[PDB]
Protein backbone atom coordinates (compact mmCIF):
# COMPACT_ATOMS: atom_id res chain seq x y z
CA UNK A 1 0.00 0.00 0.00
CA UNK A 2 1.12 3.55 -0.69
CA UNK A 3 0.63 4.72 2.89
CA UNK A 4 3.10 2.31 4.40
CA UNK A 5 6.79 3.15 3.99
CA UNK A 6 9.18 0.73 2.30
CA UNK A 7 10.16 -1.61 5.08
CA UNK A 8 13.83 -1.61 5.97
CA UNK A 9 16.13 -4.34 4.72
CA UNK A 10 17.62 -5.31 8.02
CA UNK A 11 14.73 -5.50 10.42
CA UNK A 12 12.70 -7.56 7.97
CA UNK A 13 14.48 -9.02 4.93
CA UNK A 14 17.97 -9.86 6.16
CA UNK A 15 17.00 -12.32 8.89
CA UNK A 16 14.58 -14.51 6.94
CA UNK A 17 15.73 -17.51 4.90
CA UNK A 18 15.33 -16.54 1.21
CA UNK A 19 13.35 -19.31 -0.65
CA UNK A 20 13.92 -21.99 -3.32
CA UNK A 21 14.85 -20.41 -6.67
CA UNK A 22 13.62 -21.72 -10.00
CA UNK A 23 15.72 -24.72 -10.97
CA UNK A 24 15.19 -27.53 -13.41
CA UNK A 25 15.58 -30.86 -11.56
CA UNK A 26 18.41 -32.18 -13.85
CA UNK A 27 19.71 -35.66 -14.84
CA UNK A 28 22.96 -36.66 -13.16
CA UNK A 29 23.83 -38.96 -16.06
CA UNK A 30 22.90 -36.56 -18.86
CA UNK A 31 23.96 -33.23 -17.36
CA UNK A 32 26.97 -34.26 -15.30
CA UNK A 33 29.41 -31.76 -16.75
CA UNK A 34 27.31 -28.70 -15.94
CA UNK A 35 25.11 -29.73 -13.00
CA UNK A 36 27.51 -28.42 -10.38
CA UNK A 37 28.02 -24.92 -11.76
CA UNK A 38 24.99 -24.23 -13.97
CA UNK A 39 23.11 -22.24 -11.36
CA UNK A 40 25.94 -20.27 -9.78
CA UNK A 41 25.67 -16.50 -9.63
CA UNK A 42 28.66 -16.14 -11.92
CA UNK A 43 29.25 -19.66 -13.26
CA UNK A 44 32.83 -20.94 -13.32
CA UNK A 45 34.06 -17.61 -11.97
CA UNK A 46 36.84 -19.05 -9.81
CA UNK A 47 37.90 -21.79 -12.25
CA UNK A 48 41.17 -20.73 -13.84
Amino acid sequence: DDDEPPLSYEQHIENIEPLDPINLPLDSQDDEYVKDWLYDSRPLEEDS
Binding site: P6, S8, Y9, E14
Partner: protein, 49 residues
Protein backbone atom coordinates in the same frame (compact mmCIF):
# COMPACT_ATOMS: atom_id res chain seq x y z
CA UNK B 1 18.02 -0.76 -36.30
CA UNK B 2 20.14 -2.36 -39.01
CA UNK B 3 19.41 0.29 -41.60
CA UNK B 4 20.53 3.34 -39.58
CA UNK B 5 23.63 2.50 -37.55
CA UNK B 6 24.68 5.00 -34.92
CA UNK B 7 28.36 4.51 -34.41
CA UNK B 8 29.87 5.37 -31.03
CA UNK B 9 32.54 8.00 -30.70
CA UNK B 10 36.01 7.05 -29.55
CA UNK B 11 36.81 10.19 -27.57
CA UNK B 12 34.14 9.39 -24.96
CA UNK B 13 36.66 8.62 -22.26
CA UNK B 14 34.75 10.22 -19.38
CA UNK B 15 32.26 7.71 -18.04
CA UNK B 16 29.89 8.64 -15.26
CA UNK B 17 30.74 6.07 -12.60
CA UNK B 18 34.47 6.31 -13.20
CA UNK B 19 34.67 10.08 -12.78
CA UNK B 20 32.52 9.87 -9.67
CA UNK B 21 34.81 7.18 -8.30
CA UNK B 22 37.82 9.51 -8.42
CA UNK B 23 36.10 11.93 -6.05
CA UNK B 24 36.52 11.77 -2.28
CA UNK B 25 32.74 12.07 -1.86
CA UNK B 26 31.91 8.60 -3.16
CA UNK B 27 32.67 5.37 -1.38
CA UNK B 28 32.37 1.79 -2.50
CA UNK B 29 30.97 -1.35 -0.91
CA UNK B 30 29.09 -4.53 -1.72
CA UNK B 31 25.55 -5.07 -0.51
CA UNK B 32 22.62 -7.21 -1.55
CA UNK B 33 20.65 -6.26 -4.63
CA UNK B 34 17.33 -6.05 -2.80
CA UNK B 35 18.98 -3.79 -0.26
CA UNK B 36 20.29 -1.62 -3.09
CA UNK B 37 16.81 -1.50 -4.56
CA UNK B 38 15.19 -0.45 -1.30
CA UNK B 39 17.90 2.13 -0.72
CA UNK B 40 17.20 3.60 -4.13
CA UNK B 41 13.47 3.72 -3.44
CA UNK B 42 14.10 5.54 -0.17
CA UNK B 43 16.67 7.81 -1.79
CA UNK B 44 14.43 8.52 -4.75
CA UNK B 45 11.48 9.24 -2.51
CA UNK B 46 13.55 11.79 -0.64
CA UNK B 47 14.82 13.41 -3.83
CA UNK B 48 11.33 14.13 -5.06
CA UNK B 49 10.00 15.10 -1.64
Amino acid sequence: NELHPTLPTNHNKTKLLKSLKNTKYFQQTTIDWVEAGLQLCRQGHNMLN
